[PDB]
């Protein structure tokens, strides 16, 4: 059977009254993907922010950032209000990068291949709505659609190469996000090999969740441990939600590991104690205060019967927008 997204991705294009213009496409990024890490100089915990290095990093990736944020924004605006100019603009941006063969460099380091997988997830995740909307907005744009989908397929194959062949100690949230990008790409391109890789990566993650709901590789990030556990949830929950409607039920993998992880995270958010006791360090709660970092609640509560605690957590923070997940996460799960 052809691969499909969750049913919410088939929603008609909206007609909400809102009209921004079409900005120039960010220059397609065809350079080397060898970037400075924001954690440059850290010990093995890789949890010490280097402000100067981060500034350098953000500058290096600026065109990629602008592409990710801008193109998802255009798709979101189109799905909300249905102005053809926004569709045309979004497709012009994505097809420009596709034709240029952006982000395809074989010259990369960890930070660089992470930019490749992140941008792939953002763009394909947004494009998913265009592709499967009952309005069929791509019907009039066959050439561009083909160009864009072929580019996604090239990048997806490369992302599998980028994160394959690793031992567990080197498989962390970075791989989970890569698996989301590859799952998203798999459904856009109807590529079962990509689908299968993302599923296998989820299963690795599920088996990394220990008997208490902790991930050893995320615990290693010391004061950022809780933040990184929360950061693991969105791609894992998205992968499971996508796999489910394609006939692969991952909810019970390793004794319901995804639920065990989610419940442990939410315990830590209520009270940091157990993560501190587990890591021996006070947790940086900064990221746990950011509403959109709980976007994982949308696919999660589509998968599991959420108890009132989870439901209220979702209700209080809705709607969720997360460009790395394709934009409007609440809308595609309602």
Numbering used by the authors: 28 to 45, 47 to 362
Pull text from the paper.
The alg operon also encodes a periplasmic lyase, AlgL. The structure reveals that AlgL adopts an (α/α)5 toroid fold with five pairs of antiparallel α-helices. Our in vivo studies demonstrate that AlgL does not associate with other alginate biosynthetic proteins and functions as a periplasmic homeostasis enzyme to clear the periplasm of accumulated alginate to prevent cell lysis.
In keeping with its proposed role in neutralizing the anionic substrate intermediate, we found that H202A AlgL was catalytically inactive in our in vitro alginate lyase assay and thus were anticipating that this variant would display similar growth and cellular morphology phenotypes to the other inactive variants. However, H202A displays a similar growth pattern and cellular morphology to WT. When we compared the structure of the mutant with the WT AlgL enzyme, we found that there were strikingly similar with a Cα RMSD of 0.062 Å. Examination of the structure reveals that the orientation of the side chain of K66 is altered, with the Nζ oriented toward the ManA ligand in the WT structure and oriented away from the active site in the H202A structure. Although no ligands were present during the crystallization process, the lid-loop in the H202A structure adopts a more closed conformation similar to that found in the WT AlgL structure and Y246F and H192A A1-III cocrystal structures. This conformation appears to be stabilized by hydrogen bonding between R74 and R249 and hydrophobic interactions between K66 and L67. To allow for the interaction, R74 in H202A AlgL is oriented toward subsite +1 within the active site, which is occupied by ManA in the WT structure. In WT AlgL, R74 is oriented away from the active site, suggesting that this residue may be important for anchoring the lid-loop in a closed orientation in the absence of a ligand. Given the discrepancies observed between in vivo growth phenotypes and enzymatic inactivity in vitro, and the similarity of the WT and H202A structures, we hypothesize that the H202A mutant is catalytically active, but its activity is below the level that can be detected in our current assay. In support of this, mutation of H192, the equivalent catalytic residue in A1-III, resulted in a large decrease but not complete abrogation of the alginate lyase activity.
